[PDB]
Amino acid sequence: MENFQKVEKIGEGTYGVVYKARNKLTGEVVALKKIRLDVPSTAIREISLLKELNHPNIVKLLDVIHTENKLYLVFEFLHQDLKKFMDASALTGIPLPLIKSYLFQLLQGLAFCHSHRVLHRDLKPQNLLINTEGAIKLADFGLARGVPVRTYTVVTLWYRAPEILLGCKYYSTAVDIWSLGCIFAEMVTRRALFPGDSEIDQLFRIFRTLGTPDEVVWPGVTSMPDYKPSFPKWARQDFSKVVPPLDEDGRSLLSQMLHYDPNKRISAKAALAHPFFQDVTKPVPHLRL
Numbered sequence: 001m002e003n004f005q006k007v008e009k010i011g012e013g014t015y016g017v018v019y020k021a022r023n024k025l026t027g028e029v030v031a032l033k034k035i036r037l038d039v040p041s042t043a044i045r046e047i048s049l050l051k052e053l054n055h056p057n058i059v060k061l062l063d064v065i066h067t068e069n070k071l072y073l074v075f076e077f078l079h080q081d082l083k084k085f086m087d088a089s090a091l092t093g094i095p096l097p098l099i100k101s102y103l104f105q106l107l108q109g110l111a112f113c114h115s116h117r118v119l120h121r122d123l124k125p126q127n128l129l130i131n132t133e134g135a136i137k138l139a140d141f142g143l144a145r146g147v148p149v150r151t152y153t154v155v156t157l158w159y160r161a162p163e164i165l166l167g168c169k170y171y172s173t174a175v176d177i178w179s180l181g182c183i184f185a186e187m188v189t190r191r192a193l194f195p196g197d198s199e200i201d202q203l204f205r206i207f208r209t210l211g212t213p214d215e216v217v218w219p220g221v222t223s224m225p226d227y228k229p230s231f232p233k234w235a236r237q238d239f240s241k242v243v244p245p246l247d248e249d250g251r252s253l254l255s256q257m258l259h260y261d262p263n264k265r266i267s268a269k270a271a272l273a274h275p276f277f278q279d280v281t282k283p284v285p286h287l288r289l
């Protein structure tokens with residue numbers, strides 16, 4: 001609304017485009033997500049329920065403005081996401097204390113949302129915002145269900161859990177833990193874990209690494225909707241080849257977040273007690289804003 005002055009386009013995506021905005025009344029710098037609605041009464045309640053989500057590791061939804069065929073969402077503004085930070089460290093590598101602090105902070109925000117029965121669904125490095133004080137926050141939570149922008153926004157697929165790719169309709173909190181494990185491996189190796197091009201290439205890249213799942217490790221996988229008995233049967237690779245710098249504690253923790261069975265996958269709460277975070281600290285990054 002005229003109360004906000006658009007400064008620059010900082011993003012674009014699913015039916016939504018995000019601007020850096022300045023509240024002309026208060027002077028506050030905020031993130032303004034514009035969603036062309038062409039109004040779901042059910043949705044604007046769940047949006048109002050995420051306004052109550054309150055945690056230092058979650059980008060705060062400040063205000064919800066419904067005006068005509070548009071839904072404006074005002075968020076707390078941050079200057080950089082984890083994707084821009086990983087690119088700026090592709091040659092040097094993020095130090096493990098900074099990686100460990102980040103993973104610890106994201107597991108806290110995940111443990112907060114999951115205790116409120118709130119999924120993120122669409123966890124990716126572009127959705128993880130960082131500041132200069134060493135904090136990292138979860139951003140842009142995906143609703144369970146506007147007009148798509150024609151200018152358009154592939155990398156969401158790289159972090160999808162295998163249960164979503166196999167056609168499970170009822171997601172659990174384990175889908176967010178899987179995405180975090182892929183992000184955790186990407187931070188260490190400075191390379192995407194499963195950079196697939198299609199739904200089946202994403203599935204087969206996971207199969208080539210973790211082995212093709214069966215009823216032994218994932219009971220009920222053969223009864224999943226998009227499962228096919230004609231899947232190739234690949235052998236599981238060694239975890240020391242997946243993340244070849246990481247220590248045994250991290251590889252252990254990463255292996256539990258990458259379990260095929262969502263019921264065997266580690267929860268955010270249990271992950272916080274993993275010995276990998278025994279010496280967890282909070283270092284500061286070197287950001288160029």
Ligand SMILES: CCS(=O)(=O)c1ccc(Nc2ncc3cc(Cl)c(=O)n(C4CCCC4)c3n2)c(C)c1
Pocket residue numbers: 010011012013018020031033059075076077078079080081082083084085126127129139140
């Ligand atoms: C552009 C790459 S970057 O690293 O330069 C960069 C990254 C982040 C931000 N800021 C920022 N601040 C607050 C939010 C709040 C929400 Cl909800 C949100 O979705 N996003 C974006 C993340 C997904 C697309 C919009 C936000 N972005 C800036 C200025 C640059």
